């Protein structure tokens, strides 16, 4: 899509429609005449394009109006209202730009932000841009949170986020033009390699992949069409649903075997009845022929009754010989109507052991994409975000994803090594108490108008709590925290002296032996400039490999690789790293999934701020004081960098609207 309609799409908005967010601010326009809406819409899109065309520099309300034309550049309160809404919600001038109008010398409102994950950083940058006094508290000794980039010598490999999932309407698209990230495209090609160490052949490969996607569509049909969504009071998982489909496929394989072998019997049994008939005819014949012989003994000449006798018996013998000819005829049709069916059995099994194994690898691919046992994902909703896929080739950040949070961190007040312990929010303000992770008795307190909590969901999840809210978060929020899923996935990084794999290929499966190990080192990546291979540990395996040492892991890795490229083509790895996200106390996992009995709507509850009770009773309703951003809070873009980055933008907008007010709604 291109022009001003490209921009609308590249900023994730309908180019010819006003969004529910716009209605909110422009209810004059959207409840008014069509004509104006289109003017509005244009102004919007136009502006978007401008910022998009050049995101290394700030887009001012002047610069905008300059480059508009009549009739559009005619109403300036409109233009202004639009430009300001855009800027407010981070649709323009987000990320890293040269400012023209240097910063508001004195600040307004004060905000503490928990965590310098990307959601964190993105929100800070906004708030600071909006003239606010912003400080972030990171427990770790680096920014970037779950964007971890391993660096040593020339080796570079993310144990965290690693891929940009297409630039097609991706905020990261913008960020990438603003920051020296080096984006290589990932080539889609992916050979699998069963346990033995030898490729699966195109034949199988394709027939199984196709059956897998066939089995997905299926589950979906159970969900929406058949409404199969509760099972003895428990929400139905995707895992379960897949089984129920697989069974019903195994069953029909048998129902078919049964009926085809039942045609055989119903037939082979006419044959019986006919063979019988026929054997009783050879009987009456044999004996009739006897009789006619006896009657041709009576040598001529002979009285007529005796002559009649021969003739009679003759006709009778011929009659019966017609008949047995007609039956030998029949016998002949059925006799081949059996070498018929017996030649076309139906299919023998539903799927073989070699099949069900490759099919597993396809389930590992799901578990990796949802960082969880499919036994846990919601049937109705696991994929509830699919409509918002980006377009274009997925990509890697050849100089390491960290390069981004770090970029975003510049200009910012970030207290590193500071572990929030308590959030205290009240009608008149908030204080956050944090310790120093080095010497923990050493205490800190921050007073602020507002707190933005970007705590990872696994953190928010700790029993017993690692962070205490004072007062306790209302039950609607904590239930959302329980209901939601926060999964796990790990990475193994392999550094070598030399490339010993297919240089022109970026990924390649390893099919496991069991259902149980389906995710164990199931997938490898040749992504980087240096000789580095990287392998996923996913599904059930993820959780259990954390309990195993690095060597015993790197072993199984080398094992598999030898297995695939030959025992002596695979050298001892110079450097090795192994992620353990569930263990990591500042993650307690890797990213969220919609768990069974959750919906996408829970993500919405994650984002709803908290408004304290009043101090003095009978005093009016307070401002909201506790806000949340982060991958677990963005229904439309869960579990991802852009998703987070986007929630950061979102809260910063909402908080600024709250404490600096919004001049654009008038």
């Amino acid at each position: 899509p291109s022009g001003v309609e490209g921009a609308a799409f590249q900023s994730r908005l309908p180019h010819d429609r006003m969004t529910s967010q716009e209605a909110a601010c422009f209810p004059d326009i959207i409840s008014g005449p069509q004509q104006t809406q289109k003017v509005f819409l244009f102004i919007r899109n136009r502006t978007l394009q401008l910022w998009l065309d050049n995101p290394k520099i700030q887009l001012t309300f002047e610069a905008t109006l300059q480059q508009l034309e009549a009739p559009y550049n005619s109403d300036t309160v409109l233009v202004h209202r639009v430009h300001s809404y855009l800027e407010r919600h981070g649709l323009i001038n987000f990320g890293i730009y040269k400012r023209i109008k240097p910063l508001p010398t004195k600040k307004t409102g004060k905000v503490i932000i928990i965590g310098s994950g990307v959601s964190g950083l993105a929100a800070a940058r906004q708030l600071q841009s909006f003239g606010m006094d912003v400080t972030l508290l990171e427990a770790r000794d680096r920014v970037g949170g779950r964007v971890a980039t391993f660096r040593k010598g020339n080796y570079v490999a993310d144990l965290g986020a690693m891929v940009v999932t297409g630039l097609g309407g991706n905020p990261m698209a913008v960020v990438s033009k603003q920051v020296n990230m080096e984006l290589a495209k990932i080539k889609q090609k992916c050979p699998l390699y069963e346990a033995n160490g030898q490729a699966v052949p195109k034949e199988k490969d394709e027939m199984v992949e196709q059956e897998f996607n066939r089995l997905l569509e299926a589950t979906s049909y159970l969900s929406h069409q058949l409404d199969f969504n509760v099972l003895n009071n428990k929400p139905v998982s995707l895992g379960q649903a897949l089984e129920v489909v697989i069974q019903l496929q195994e069953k029909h394989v048998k129902d078919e075997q049964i009926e085809h072998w039942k045609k055989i019997v119903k037939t082979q049994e006419e044959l019986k009845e006919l063979l019988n008939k026929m054997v009783n005819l050879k009987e009456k014949i044999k004996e009739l022929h006897q009789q006619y012989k006896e009657a041709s003994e009576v040598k001529p000449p002979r009285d007529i009754t005796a002559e009649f006798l021969v003739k009679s018996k003759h006709r009778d013998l011929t009659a019966l010989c017609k008949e047995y000819d007609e039956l030998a005829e029949t016998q002949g049709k059925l006799e081949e109507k059996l070498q018929e069916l017996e030649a076309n059995p139906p299919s023998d099994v539903y799927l073989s052991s070699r099949d069900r194994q490759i099919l597993d690898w396809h389930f590992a691919n799901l578990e990796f994409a949802n960082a969880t046992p499919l036994s846990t994902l919601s049937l109705k909703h696991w994929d509830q975000d699919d409509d918002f896929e980006f377009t274009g080739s997925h990509l890697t950040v050849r100089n390491g994803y960290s390069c981004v949070p770090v970029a975003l961190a510049e200009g910012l007040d970030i207290k590193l090594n500071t572990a929030v312990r308590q959030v205290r929010y009240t009608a008149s303000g908030c204080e956050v108490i944090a310790v120093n992770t080095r010497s923990t008795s050493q205490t800190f307190i921050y007073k602020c108008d507002a707190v933005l909590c970007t705590l990872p969901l696994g953190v928010l999840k700790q029993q017993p709590p690692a962070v205490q809210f004072v007062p306790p978060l209302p039950e609607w929020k904590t239930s959302a925290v329980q209901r939601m899923g926060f999964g796990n996935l790990n990475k193994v990084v392999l550094c070598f002296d030399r490339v010993f794999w297919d240089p022109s290929v970026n990924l390649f499966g390893h099919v496991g032996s069991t259902t149980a190990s389906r995710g164990e080192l199931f997938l490898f990546w040749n992504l980087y400039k240096a000789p580095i291979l990287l392998a996923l540990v996913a599904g059930e395996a993820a959780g259990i490999m954390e309990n195993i040492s690095d060597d015993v892991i790197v072993g199984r890795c080398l094992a598999i690789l030898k297995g695939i490229f030959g025992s002596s083509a695979v050298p001892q790895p110079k450097e090795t790293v192994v992620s353990r996200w569930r263990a990591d106390p500042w993650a307690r996992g890797s990213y969220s999934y919609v768990a069974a009995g959750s919906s996408g709507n829970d993500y919405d509850l994650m984002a709803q701020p908290i408004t304290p009770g009043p101090s003095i009773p009978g005093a009016p309703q307070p401002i909201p004081r506790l806000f949340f951003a982060g991958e677990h809070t963005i229904r439309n873009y869960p579990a991802t960098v852009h998703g987070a980055l986007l929630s950061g933008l979102r809260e910063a907008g909402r908080i600024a609207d709250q404490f600096l007010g919004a001049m654009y709604t008038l």
């Binding site: 089995l215 997905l216 994409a369 994929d383 699919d386 990924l507």
Partner: peptide, 16 residues
């Protein structure tokens, strides 16, 4: 989420 999937992208149960 499906959207995470880079390698052999699941097709099934999708609105293409």
């Amino acid at each position: 989420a499906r959207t995470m999937q880079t390698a052999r992208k699941s097709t099934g149960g999708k609105a293409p």
